[PDB]
Structures are given as structure tokens and as C-alpha cells.
Design a protein around this ligand. Structure first.
Ligand SMILES: *[C@@H]1O[C@H](CO)[C@@H](O)[C@H](O)[C@H]1NC(C)=O
Ligand SMILES: *[C@@H]1O[C@H](CO)[C@@H](O)[C@H](O)[C@H]1NC(C)=O
Ligand SMILES: *[C@@H]1O[C@H](CO)[C@@H](O)[C@H](O)[C@H]1NC(C)=O
Lengths: 113, 115
């Protein structure tokens, strides 16, 4: 049974710096993508997925173009106080449309001075 | 991501009995098709899907001729074929989305009717 694991329950960054949010999966099946969101409800802001792109501030920390890769950590650049919140790494399964299969437990991000 | 060898647009005439919309992934590593999923999208709908795990193709009744050649899929060829009557009545931009296990990617091709 797949596990989506965010090792950091909390991240603390200075404003103007990058923030790294960690996520790893224990399996690459079932078939479907990992995406990052801020928030968990229907108002959640899509933060990252692998499709190019429209994510000028968010970037993959690993070699996610490789089949073997089970890490889906990301770096968010030029952190501002508006970026503070709870970020989730979520696994989907393919369909018309795709469905949410499993979520990480959350990483609370805070911006310090 | 899955990465693509991209074509901006393809053109066809009435002489084309079957129209092909190209889609070529350059870093496919799958050893079994059960690992792959393909979606072709047109004006906000999936006009063809291939679920590898179930080995099931699905098209709507107005794209009834639409298909891919599954034997070419593991080479990264996800090109869509359809007949001219389905093609002429559905010109515009198509989105090819390919997934292999957890890696994904998409690309867009404009299907054009030209004289
Ligand atoms: C239609 O036929 C022409 C010439 O044979 C070919 O170059 C073109 O790619 C075909 N178009 C499509 C969409 O398959
Ligand atoms: C998949 O489906 C086709 C029919 O679309 C069938 O002929 C084939 O035997 C099936 N199984 C596999 C493993 O390809
Ligand atoms: C398809 O996309 C291209 C991108 O340049 C655009 O110019 C064209 O008008 C689009 N076609 C339709 C039918 O929306």
C-alpha cells in the first residue's frame, strides 16, 4: 500500500530565501501524478506538477525526469510572508478525470524575519 | 516529467483517409504497458484514453474511429489516428498527455484543415 510521506511537519525560512518542501513515495504505482497544493479544501492553490508549467517560482529538487525517482520534493523561491501555510504532497490516479488517491500529512511553512 | 519531441501543428486535406496527430515521448522507460496511461484532449474533453492497467481504450461516439497503435506505445509513440470525417469536424488544438507510473507530461498539437 502506497505511502506519501512528508518528513517535515514544519519548515521555517527567512523571507527572500528559498523553501524546500520534502515528499517521498514508497511506490510508483498505481499509475498517476504527484502534485503539490497549498491548502486541502476546494480553494487549494496548485503549487506544482511536472507539466511545463506556469510555475515560475516552484522547482523540482530531484531528477524527476527519471523513471526510478521516488522523491517529489520542491523548492519555492523568493519566499514572502504570503507563502506561509500548510502544503500537501498528493498522489492521483488516472481517469476521466483523475482522482485523489493519497495525500501526505502536511508541512506547515512559516516565514521569519 | 516525461519529455516530448514536439510538433506545433499538422495539416490535412480531404485526400487524407486517415489523419495522424503525432505524439512522441523522448524519455519513455516503461517495460510493460500496464505502467502507461494516455489521454488525448480536445476542447475540454478526453476524446481518447488508454488505460494500460486495464488494457482499455475509450472514445466518445463522435470520435468513434479514434485510436492509437498500442504496439508503438513503449517506444514512446502515442500518436492518435482517426478517419477524415472525424478529423474534419474536429479541427483545433489537441492535448496529448502521457503518464508512466508517476512521471507525467503533455504536449499540444493544432490539427488544421487546409486546401
Ligand atoms: C495528410 O497527408 C499528408 C501527405 O500525405 C501528410 O504529410 C500529413 O501528415 C497527413 N496529415 C495528417 C494529419 O495525418
Ligand atoms: C488487450 O486488449 C486487446 C484488445 O483491445 C486484446 O487483443 C489483448 O489480448 C489484450 N491483452 C493484452 C495483454 O494486451
Ligand atoms: C489552437 O491553438 C493555436 C495556438 O497558436 C491558436 O492560434 C488557434 O486559434 C487555436 N485553435 C482553436 C480552434 O481554438
Amino acid at each position: 500500500e502506497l505511502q506519501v510521506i512528508q518528513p517535515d511537519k514544519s519548515v521555517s525560512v527567512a523571507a527572500g530565501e528559498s523553501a524546500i518542501l520534502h515528499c517521498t513515495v514508497t511506490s510508483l504505482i498505481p499509475v498517476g501524478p504527484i502534485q503539490w497544493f497549498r491548502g486541502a479544501g476546494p480553494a487549494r492553490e496548485l503549487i506544482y506538477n511536472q507539466k511545463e508549467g506556469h510555475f515560475p517560482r516552484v522547482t523540482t529538487v530531484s531528477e524527476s525526469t527519471k523513471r526510478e525517482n521516488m522523491d517529489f520534493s520542491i523548492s519555492i523561491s523568493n519566499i514572502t510572508p504570503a507563502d506561509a501555510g500548510t502544503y500537501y504532497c498528493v498522489k492521483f490516479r488516472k481517469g476521466s478525470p483523475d482522482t485523489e488517491f493519497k495525500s501526505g500529512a502536511g508541512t506547515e511553512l512559516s516565514v521569519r524575519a | 516529467q516525461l519529455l516530448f519531441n514536439k510538433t506545433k501543428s499538422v495539416e490535412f486535406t480531404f485526400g487524407n483517409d486517415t489523419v495522424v496527430i503525432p505524439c512522441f515521448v523522448t524519455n519513455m522507460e516503461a517495460q510493460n504497458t500496464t505502467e502507461v496511461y494516455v489521454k488525448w484532449k480536445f476542447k475540454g474533453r478526453d476524446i481518447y484514453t488508454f488505460d494500460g492497467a486495464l488494457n482499455k481504450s475509450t472514445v466518445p461516439t463522435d470520435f468513434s474511429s479514434a485510436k492509437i497503435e498500442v504496439s508503438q506505445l513503449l517506444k514512446g509513440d502515442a500518436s492518435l489516428k482517426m478517419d477524415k470525417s472525424d478529423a474534419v469536424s474536429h479541427t483545433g488544438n489537441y492535448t496529448c498527455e502521457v503518464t508512466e507510473l508517476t512521471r507525467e507530461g503533455e504536449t499540444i498539437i493544432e490539427l488544421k484543415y487546409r486546401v
